[PDB]
A paper describes a structure:
Toxoplasma and Plasmodium are the parasitic agents of toxoplasmosis and malaria, respectively, and use perforin-like proteins (PLPs) to invade host organisms and complete their life cycles. Escape from the PV, and therefore from the infected cell, for subsequent rounds of infection has been shown to be dependent on the perforin-like protein TgPLP1 (T. gondii PLP). We report structures of the membrane attack complex/perforin (MACPF) and Apicomplexan PLP C-terminal β-pleated sheet (APCβ) domains of TgPLP1. The MACPF domain forms hexameric assemblies, with ring and helix geometries, and the APCβ domain has a novel β-prism fold joined to the MACPF domain by a short linker.
Numbering used by the authors:
A (entry chain A), B (entry chain A), C (entry chain A), D (entry chain A), E (entry chain A), F (entry chain A), ...: 465 to 500, 514 to 600, 605 to 683, 727 to 800
């Protein structure tokens, strides 16, 4: 199978309940860590018998409830929320924000977890060649940290190709974040997750959307046979459905860590959506 | 595939749950906008993995409930209803109006969405050559806006070939509306939609009609195999199943915008059906 | 194809779910109206894409439930039932009447509509040459309307060749009704209809009869392939599966209308079956 | 084709689902009635379009359930069962009686009717020359009706050639019954009937026997092509698959009717099998 | 054709689903009974129209299931199993015993019966000249019935030519059993039988063996044409496919019956295979 | 015909589904055993009626599945696999290894057995004169068993004519193995076997190769007539299609058995292909 | 027979399914390699028994599918496609390109291989005298590799006799390529190959063309006898039907290898057809 331990993660564009254009969390990025059934040196893989099943149901009354339901599946190591406008750039976040503004409807989220294994690290890491080469091209200073820098977070959101930004090294830092994300996975449960978002008016007006992580693309969620076939494909293509992350600056040389932290703060503001 | 972004739309004759004489919404009209996987300049196309699945169920107690269920899939940009006798000239609207008048039966609508991609524009447009040539033949004044004009909306409904109307420029304006519609699509979800309208008496008397948007014509809705084959054809022939529109007068020169707005108001009254 | 718009219809001998000796409703009669894809002057034809599919299921607890299920597919213009012992002379009506008398069984009717087009008129008609010549041979008076006329409805049912009837003009009127029916079709949905009448005892004792309208004769209803081939023949030979009728006396000269109405009343009693 | 209207019928040896040594009901006997597409004087023939299809399924828990399933297809005029040990001398009855005694198995019967026409009489009949000559040789008294007659029903079952019986006229009466039966057909549906008797143990142990009425002998019931070819031969050789009978004594002179009724009662006991 | 009524039958070496070295049951032996379309005195022959078709399917989970499936086609008169290590010396029994020991596979048996006639006796028999002469050479005592007789069943299985056995009359008795068997057929269905033994692993690993009784040798079971030609040869060479037997000692003089019963018990142990 | 009982067998070069350069298994070697319809002393021959037909189908997902499908037809006495790189030097093994490496295709194997007889031995054998003379020329020691012997299995694979090997007795042992093989047949089914290896891409892209054992060379597998003619030649030239073998060292004097076992181990490594 | 091992091959003009003007691949060129049943030094020849039969079927939806079906039979050593506009100058490629442009038809390719032997080399080669003399006349530089050289690939396609090209050494290099090709065969299967290209409209409109490699010219593909006679001639005149090639520059002196590679690139562009 595919190893997701040590994968990069964009906390702003991520969404741990899924995305219609991906079979997994849209924030997962190429592998950042390099490793040595089989146990990776410095970590562990614990395989399950069939699928470890769990279900959750939540009434999502506001954006904060939705944020909390996502943070449960994509948090910092230990369970604390990532914060910093996490998930706010994903399609699912913008879709729910529209529905929760309508005070005439109420939405519920029903998660169904189909976990197949758990993996994690415990801590002297080596990064991939791609990540190391990317880091070697980074400067030691983030230009937008300077006060009255022409390239602000608002300027980047409006036009990143403007002269105010293309003269600074800000585009170099953002290209790095766009490639590898802002965090990386240190612990994960992999398998499948089928989530139903059910909206009821205030007429038995009910709407249901299905969001799927893991396995092969499912043809029909309402078909009993098509749902069962999807779970059989989850064994073949398991993907992270609940994970914990560590900030990426821990993997950079110390002279670049402060600039990268400023870069992800800039990135969270320019790409992330505050509730406005 | 076929581009439906920028397609004209007749809000009066349209019906976003379908029509037995069309594989799509019968209000979709030839392309009005001209554009430059591949991204259109000024817009975007977001392709999905397999099909983005959603289902809705609603009890349709009166004509207003049916109107609301259609407006969900064909609205103004932002979600507001088009209004102005929208959908009232379609076959499906007249069929449901007959069934809802019978107080001894109750009808439910079950939608099944099979969305394959999303497209939209964000706003300096260029129209098609057909639309530009059509606009160049339009006058600057709509004759029926003049008080005591012999060609009224009622006169047009009774006999549009009468001398009262053929002397005015009203037939020229209506031929334009009949060709391109009254609005145009600015955002759309494309794919397939299978809707069941289920009517129960007050005897297990139950009637079910199937209405299909998108894909190839389905041979048997009750056959499990024929339904699955239809979804496989939805990948090949996706069509708009939920979209948002902007009024067409925004695309006309300013000296003709006021006359066109009067023309669509006239058109909505003469062709559209008030609940009488 | 064959035009059924304006066809005569015997409401007493008709049966809109079918007959084992006909591929269509056994009450359909030769064309009464003459007309001028292609649109008939004074009417319309609306062709469908593939087949417009609808299904109904009903528990038939008594003869009235069966009558209602037939009246749905063969009614007066507007939806009102024809009445006047409608369908009571058909084989299917007599078959169901026998089964419903057995209180130890319960019967259900499952309709499957495969509609291919809709046609209708809106109202100065011209009748066929056969119908006009038939009308010219009719008297102005119906003899059995006279009190104490020897030829009563009971006498006609027992022996129509008796002297009591052969001396009156009653046989002339009945020969006209036997040729053209009592009504004529003004609106129709054409295609195919497969109806299952399922009877369950009170042992999994279940009986199922198949009744077919439209297309070519089907070899095996249980064969999946033979059923699909039948639908392909429905495109070639579509027939009325749900229609609305107008009384034939509207097409006769005024001096003969009252006598014809008395003739169809006589015909409905002598040929039709009251529930005895 | 061959006329079966008015055919004699042995209710004891008959079996309306078939017999391996006959292509039809083994109780059908040579024609008893003589008659004058073409309509027989005093009766009717109603030809079907293709085949009128019906299917039945029944769980046969005991001998009474099997008896009821046969009586459905061979009953008295009106639907009442013939009774009097009907069908009990047929091979199929004895075969099923053996299987139903095994309480470790369960048997189901699946009938498939392929009806091609219906025929019947309504009531002054004339019998065939063979039947009239047979009746002329019958006595006016049945000897075994006399109390303490040496030739009893048990004596006939043990040895009909014994002196106790050969001295009476009992062998003359039984030879008549053996030639023409005990009843005669007054109404019938003709065509084909394929019946499956499926027995399941309590291992997927399932047994299926095929019993066929009508058409040409079928080579392979499991072959799809061989089954379809059989139905094509049903058009050529249709045979009664569901019929109603009247007792034969109605066709005898009154002075012999009472003796014949005693003869068929004797015959039903001596040849028929009580459940012992 | 060839008469199999009264044929000898070796219950130990027999196998009613067939043998690759025979066209029939390998336990059928030369005729033991002598008899006098045509009906044998004391018995009956009932000829079928074409072929009486029946099919069975069974999952054979252990040796007992296989034994039961064979006993269905070769049993004592009345249906009771023969027992006494029946069928255990046949090639097919040893082949299946090997496959059922593999717990990683599952085997199914599919029987297809093509019965052409039934024959039987009801009970003063006369045996053939060969059988009578064979019986006249038999002693009145079976030597191995004596306790501590050197010729035991184990000794016969190891070396029947040893001095321990050649001094006794045991070889005389076994030569009789080897010629005529242990039972004889009293009732039989004759025709053809094609049986498929299908073994599936736990990869779509499936194995199928074909075993044929009756008719001419079939060239290709997978060829549709070669299978149909085989059935045409079944009419020419019908053989017993389901029969009932009676022990042979009923045909011996009373002074030899007890010794013969001991001989068949000895034979069943020495030649038959207990599940070890 | 030709006796294959006691034939030598090269387990490394063998392939029981065939070879394009042989009409039989390419591992069959000249006769090793000498023997005395007709029964060989110490063994048996069981002739079949026509052909004993069996068919198998298997999806071959990896090299292990292919190995298992061959081991079914060429195993140790009892059914255990030979192992020791069996079949790995055959052309068919190398061909399949290439196709299974392509993860974009899937291959199935369809076997069709046409068995004509079975033969075997039960155990004091005498070998042929050729085998005895060959054994007399063998040393008592295998030189490559000595540690740090210059002639290793790798050295033999690279250049067997090098000085490192030509000085040892290794070439003498390998010439013996090349002549007689490593095992010998103790039980066999002889006849014909036609195997189809069908490869499907992931476009209906399908490839099929035919591999034939037994009979005369077939001109066209797709021709129905040419296939039937091949089976007629299988009767004339039957060859082993499923057999069991015993190691050859059992036939050597005890002082040479250990050296021969080391020789076949050396041979299996130098000539056989490990999955690299 | 004729040796094709080491034959030159024009990858641009070649076509491994055939050509109407050749009995073999039209890209095969005279022998380039010189060698020493009989085994060539440095290579091998493996003769088959009769013909090794294989069949393939493929739906050719676009030019890429056709390219893939040819590349299967003419690839680089190892199976990788040659590329570089391979096969694009052959008649068959241009014929199929015309048919695949018609979106109203669908074409399938059915290959039938009749392989008689396999040959190959493993690697110090010696070339033929013709090839060596040809190479000695080649320059060390390819003139068209120089930027702004008047003789471009387009100029060569339009007029190779123009002054722009006749002044350079380009015609010398192209004459060499035209004589010996661009690659040479290192491994081959020889025999016959009959390929059917079947085109169906969307009326049972079907077209079939036959393309033949190997043997003598066949008179009638539809004649069963003429097809069989062709296979008998395949034994006499076997030709390569599936082969692998190595680039010719490996056979040139190192000082000319770079210029020859530029020459074949030039040749592939000037003679080969890009999909325009
Ligand atoms: C990668 O890091 C591990 C410790 O996590 C270390 O054992 C290993 O040596 C490193 N890789 C290499 C190639 O040395
Ligand atoms: C069409 O409009 C786009 C902007 O939407 C513009 O870039 C383009 O130049 C216009 N078309 C042409 C032919 O110029
Ligand atoms: C038939 O009636 C139509 C109107 O329904 C009329 O236009 C036409 O003239 C009539 N037929 C003829 C032959 O005039
Ligand atoms: C037979 O009976 C019919 C009435 O069922 C009668 O009309 C006819 O005359 C009779 N046959 C003859 C030969 O008279
Ligand atoms: C054979 O036995 C039958 C009774 O089964 C008997 O009728 C006949 O006489 C016997 N055979 C001879 C030759 O007598
Ligand atoms: C060959 O061996 C058999 C036993 O398998 C033996 O009977 C025979 O005597 C041996 N051959 C000779 C020539 O003795
Ligand atoms: C040709 O090359 C071979 C090796 O492939 C070599 O053995 C031979 O000597 C060469 N030809 C001549 C004439 O030497």
């Amino acid at each position: 199978a595919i190893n997701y331990l040590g994968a990069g993660y964009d906390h702003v564009r991520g969404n741990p309940v899924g995305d219609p254009s991906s079979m997994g969390d849209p924030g997962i990025r190429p592998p950042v860590l390099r490793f040595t059934v089989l146990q990776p040196l410095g970590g562990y893989v614990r395989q399950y018998v069939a699928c470890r099943q769990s279900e959750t149901i939540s009434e999502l009354s506001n954006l904060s409830d939705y944020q909390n339901e996502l943070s449960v599946d994509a948090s910092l190591q230990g369970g604390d929320p990532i914060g910093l406008n996490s998930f706010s750039a994903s399609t699912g976040y913008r879709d729910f924000a529209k529905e929760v503004s309508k005070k005439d409807t109420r939405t519920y989220m029903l998660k169904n977890y189909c976990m197949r294994y758990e993996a994690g690290v415990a801590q002297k890491w080596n990064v991939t060649l791609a990540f190391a080469a990317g880091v070697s091209q980074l400067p030691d200073v983030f230009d937008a940290h300077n006060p009255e820098c022409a390239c602000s977070a608002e300027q980047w959101r409006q036009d990143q190709n403007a002269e105010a930004c293309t003269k600074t090294n800000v585009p170099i830092w953002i290209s790095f974040i766009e490639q590898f994300g802002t965090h990386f996975l240190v612990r994960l449960f992999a398998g499948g997750k089928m989530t139903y978002q059910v909206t009821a008016k205030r007429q038995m007006n009910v709407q249901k959307e299905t969001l799927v992580i893991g396995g092969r693309p499912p043809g029909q969620v309402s078909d009993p046979a098509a749902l069962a076939a999807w779970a059989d494909t989850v064994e073949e293509l398991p993907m992270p459905v609940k994970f914990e992350v560590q900030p990426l600056y821990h993997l950079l040389p110390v002279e670049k860590q402060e600039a990268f932290k400023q870069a992800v703060t800039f990135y969270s503001k320019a790409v992330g959506l505050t509730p406005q």
